[PDB]
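Purpose: get a first structural picture of the assembly so the mutagenesis plan has something to point at.
Setup: eight entries, given in the order below. No constraints added.
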Amino acid sequence: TVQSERAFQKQPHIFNNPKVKTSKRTKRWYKNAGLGFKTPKTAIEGSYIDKKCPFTGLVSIRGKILTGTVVSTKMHRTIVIRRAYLHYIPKYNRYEKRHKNVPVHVSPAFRVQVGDIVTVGQCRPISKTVRFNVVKVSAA
Amino acid sequence: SKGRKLNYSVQDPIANYEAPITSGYKWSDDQIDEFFAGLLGQ
Amino acid sequence: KSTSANDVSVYQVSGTNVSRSLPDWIAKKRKRQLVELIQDFEFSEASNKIKVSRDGQYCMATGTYKPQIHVYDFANLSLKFDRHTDAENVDFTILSDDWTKSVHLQNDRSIQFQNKGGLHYTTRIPKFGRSLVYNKVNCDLYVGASGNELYRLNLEKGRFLNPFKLDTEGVNHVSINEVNGLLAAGTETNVVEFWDPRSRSRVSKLYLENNIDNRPFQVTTTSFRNDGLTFACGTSNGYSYIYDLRTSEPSIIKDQGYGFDIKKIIWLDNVGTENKIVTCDKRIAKIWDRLDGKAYASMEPSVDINDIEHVPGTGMFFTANESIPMHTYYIPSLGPSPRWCSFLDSITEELEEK
Amino acid sequence: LVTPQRLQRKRHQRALKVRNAQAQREAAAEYAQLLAKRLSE
Amino acid sequence: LDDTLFKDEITTFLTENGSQSIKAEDEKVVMPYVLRIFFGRAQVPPTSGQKRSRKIAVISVLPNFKKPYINDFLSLASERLDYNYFFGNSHQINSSKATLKTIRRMTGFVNIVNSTLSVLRTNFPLHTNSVLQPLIYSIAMAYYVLDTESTEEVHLRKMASNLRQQGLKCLSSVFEFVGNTFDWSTSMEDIYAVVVKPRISHFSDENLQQPSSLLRLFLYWAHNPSLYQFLYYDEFATATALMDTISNQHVKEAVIGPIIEAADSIIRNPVNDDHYVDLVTLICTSCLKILPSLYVKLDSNSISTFLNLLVSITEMGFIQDDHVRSRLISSLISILKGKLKKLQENDTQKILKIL
Amino acid sequence: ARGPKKHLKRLAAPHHWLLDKLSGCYAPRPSAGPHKLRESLPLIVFLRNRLKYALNGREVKAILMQRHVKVDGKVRTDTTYPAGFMDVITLDATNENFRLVYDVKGRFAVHRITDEEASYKLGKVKKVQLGKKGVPYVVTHDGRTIRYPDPNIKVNDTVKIDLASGKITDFIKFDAGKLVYVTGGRNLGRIGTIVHKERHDGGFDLVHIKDSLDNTFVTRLNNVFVIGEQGKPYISLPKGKGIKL
Amino acid sequence: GISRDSRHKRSATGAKRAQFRKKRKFELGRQPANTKIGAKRIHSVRTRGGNKKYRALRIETGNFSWASEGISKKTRIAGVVYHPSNNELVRTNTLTKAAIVQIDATPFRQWFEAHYGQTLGKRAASAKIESSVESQFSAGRLYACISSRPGQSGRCDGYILEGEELAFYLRRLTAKK
RNA sequence: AUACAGUGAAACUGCGAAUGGCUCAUUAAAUCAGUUAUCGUUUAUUUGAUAGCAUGGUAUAACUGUGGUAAUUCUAGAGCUAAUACAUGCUAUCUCGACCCUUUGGAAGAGAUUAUUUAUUAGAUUCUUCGGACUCUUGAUGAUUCAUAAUAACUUUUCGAAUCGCAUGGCCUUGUGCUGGCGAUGGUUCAUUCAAAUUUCUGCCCUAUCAACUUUCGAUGGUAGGAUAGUGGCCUACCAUGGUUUCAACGGGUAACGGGGAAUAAGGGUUCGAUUCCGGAGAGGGAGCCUGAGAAACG
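Result (structure tokens, whole complex):
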């Protein structure tokens, strides 16, 4: 469904003139994110409208690129990913088993499930808790 | 939701804001009750 | 400072000296680059609503640009003070006789509390606010919201007892009568309900009626008269019914004005008779007598009016509007000037010898 | 009061206007010539 | 008369079918003074962006109401102007007035009429006492100051040249905007005299590098069937001027293309009157002149439509003899030397129809 | 702090000004000007602590008000003018030109120069862009932006400019195997040959440099200032020539 | 005053913060400029930098553009018909970005009649306008969408709803009334 | 020196007064220390680029004189006059160039000729005179709806020198005709500088005689809107229930400002960290406004 809300979901400033009778009647815009990442076919030719999509929305990726594992997918277009690493602790000459859970916006183009390993990039702040946007999923 | 919920919650300052007040009735309600009865229903 | 009608002498003591189509901001810049009675009697953006304090010495008004309140004192004849709030306040009443406590239905779907010492805390209302009235024999702020709810707030409990039910999508005007302490609610679906406190029951429901063009009304005035027995309803076609207390027949049946909605009906206690003010967005305010039901006078400020009040003594009609000066009218034909502008009778002599 | 010094200042201002116009014109013309010879070569 | 509220007070009260609109008899009694104040509000110069925004406001003011307000406005404009010198004489001026004030009045007239033309493209009327008389007065006085005075008054000669060019382009615009609503035969002889004085004499050497308004006007003459009366009024003066432009080889392909468009139109348009046959034989001389062209002089649209001109020549056959058939096989070897990769199979089939 | 700061404590000065600690308590704040702040050298500390031509700030002010000390052909009159890297300071009665250039120890230093080398200047072309009427321009490091450059100039170039008028004399591209100057980093002040140029994605473009005593080290392209070609440095170096022992 | 920061909110680990400092000026929040239909009344504000930001509290005239033909004309406003913020604001006529409005049609009628000669309603291949907007032309009032921010510039410039968005919002209109 | 020119009180005007200085009550990622972004924004000044009427108006301070009053840095009446005050208003070049000509070119003609707000486009990935010719398929990053360019509109709406100092020249129809030196302030845009704003990853004192929490008044996001310089549950309208976890969350104790330091035992590392550097917060109470590039100032 492409019109699931009371506002006409469309990207800004794109205009398909009804004066020409072209076959491809819906014009879609995307962009090459680069950074050693690929623009997937479902993103570049899907029928979804997003602003926080890293490939079709108006948010660029810049800064730090992180890795995580999918824990819970029970919020729209956003997934919390879990960072697992070891801790610098001085007292007893060893590490400590620690973890960090990072809420990350996801585009609906990628297909995701619990436990997938994902690489993400920093993006400009969208909401109170989200700071990152995914750039590549990988199944496991 | 955000502020669209009516829940009967207790408020601190407004309970002692201005209450109580006067019984400024112009009548004794003994005629006004049967006046309600003898309103436009009858 | 002029006169509109011919047989009767009316007086706009403060108002735009330019009549129409030459806008007020360019007019004031032009005339300041090329006599008022109260110091700084203007807002220079707009104004919403007026309620004179019960003492008859404070004039509280709400205006729009950086939405604020002008508190004037008739003793000082200037701003007692000014105070900015967040959003454009729509409905307000001063709870006490002095201005020390004020409540206001605020357009951001909330209720706010203006005070002497400051500003007590805002409280949200679950639906969009339509009309708030203060019951003053049982301490109640009750507000008809957007649609089917009329929420209720007691000043001893602080909680909400129960929202009253009005089975329409709009709550266009609410009033309370204290001579007989009943609740009145008029809705633009040609429906008017009357409610009963101390027992929590609706007692009356009426007032389907059509105009000449067969259109539904929009009742914007649900008031009553000084006796607390006969009521007055008024809607968008310049249409004024004055009903009695318990009959289906209106006592007075009048049509006037235009398709522009009338905004306020108010009573006046003359020396021998009862009179009526209709105020309409036909930029008009007509002054009837109720026995004849006759427009004895009429005032045209040439620019629209959003609210009217009459001073409790005699003579003065405050009017809150969208213009630069909040404007007020003097009527010699009901009584003299009040105790504090006591030279306006001599200014009346001046305009008559002019 | 209108002075010959003021007329001197005014014609000096007009002279500076036409002078900077001429300088911009020569700069644009020489850049066009440079780009033309670079593109032909 | 006020300034800072102008365009919005216009779009409030003076718009018909709006609030506080002026009634019909009130329009009848107050509109002349409205014409005068809007004459001032058009006489305003657009030296700034806000000033030209108010000029675009007045150009949106004019074409809404009706015809007779604007017609009386143009008659008052001509009254500030005059044509009674040139039309109390035949084409003479008794008191020569080449003053900058006079030509400035003419230029302001040109500005206001081209503005109302551009905003009222189709529904504008042509009041005869307000367009032909002052426009030919303007361009005639332009030619008068062109030939009488020397090059000393460079201000006057420069503004005269701009006035003349604006006169050509506004005459072209009004002709292409009305088409054939009415017969111009009242002063058609006089406007054709103004046509035949400079243009057939010196049309090819001057207007050859880029397409001109005069050439577009003569294209419209050939395009619409009623505008042949100049050609049938003289001994084909504009036709031989067109032939001279075609014969000159320094003329650009973008100039010569629309000439052959008009040539296809005038060959396609039949009329059973005098001189039409000698006219189309002069267009056969134009075929003789286009014979070396199209590949050493003259563009996919161009080569397509000129080939269509050859196909139309074949289908109607207004030219038949062995002379034009040898010229046809010469044009055939030329156009078959010409390329085919940028062409369409249907156009090749039309080549086969010619063959 | 509420707004911008406008003073500079003595100990908080950059270390390579060699300002002593026991003269007062403050240090001069360099003006708003062409070059940077934290890596510059003001005229006041130039004419007092560097050249010993004056004793007090009042005498430096009297000198600059007599207008002798031209800078880049133009006359300065203010005391806290922030001279930086590759600058021209022109003393007309002491008959000297000075290229303010770096040394190996990191300290800014003078170089006595005659007019045939004062008349030009090497600037690190840093940011090329376009502007009004579609015209191109190029932004150097010293606040000098040149509209209408030669289109063969790219990002991270070196341009030699006229000083009197302001036209570009010529330009030098960024090729591996040239003579470069290192501006930042730990080992700023050395010259050698750049052997190659690796690239990162969104990171620092690190460069290896071999110096003429044939030793390798690592710098960064943000620090690299291209000076010239093999055996032909376009400016006269100070003695030491990037050989540190 | 109205603060724009976030330290008055709870944290992300189920925790409330403390007051960090007093509200500094560089995070200001002001009154929304809920513009109503009326005679044009705009206020000027001097904001950060030398910025002159204008808040229209009443506006009478808006600019609207045809995207299909590609023109633009200044025109009055009949009034709001739909806004996806709140239906009560649609009722109380709050002119806002991304709202639906009814506009008069006689200036575009004058434009089409002047440029074409064919009166709308009742170069035809260049005159084939949509049937819904031609019915709105014959009625005298067309539909449009407004998306100029009211309280950042004090202007109302939008585009006349053409086929796709016009059809979606006409379906929304018919589902509303 | 018969307009002033030297000297200069007062007053108007411009600029600054948000720098500096002082104390430690608070707060355990709140600031902070390191690192990064601004492809998420704003900046007076500096510096450098950058714009094709022989001069109009008033309205006043300063100042003279009448005053009331008990009076503060109290005012009123009456009489003057200036601006960088305030408000206003004006002034020929390029493209193709036939033709004449060869050098060096003009010469009629056809054409074009600052700031906003919206909408639409572009900016895309073989032959040899072995002596010689082409006879074919913007910049930017890791990327930007980018800079930029264009059209049509649009605006309660703009600067596009009505200034000032020294000297006084060049030409000649010797008119006071027309030019011309050095430099002080102003004005748009862009860059630079100085800053301000939010931010990415890690690092905090003790505690389970403290295992459960936000879920309302947003606590998690999305759709959409207003708010400033800008993203943003910043807040608001609809929907779902999201996240912390003994990997101790949450709050509870520090007479704890933090960072750097200093003393200290020959050693694990321990006590001030008040000092003299960098950051952080603050000066009747509370609320609301003010000017400015810059404040929630301490005025």
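Residues 1-140 of chain A form a domain with the OB fold (Dihydrolipoamide Acetyltransferase, E2P) fold (CATH 2.40.50.1000).
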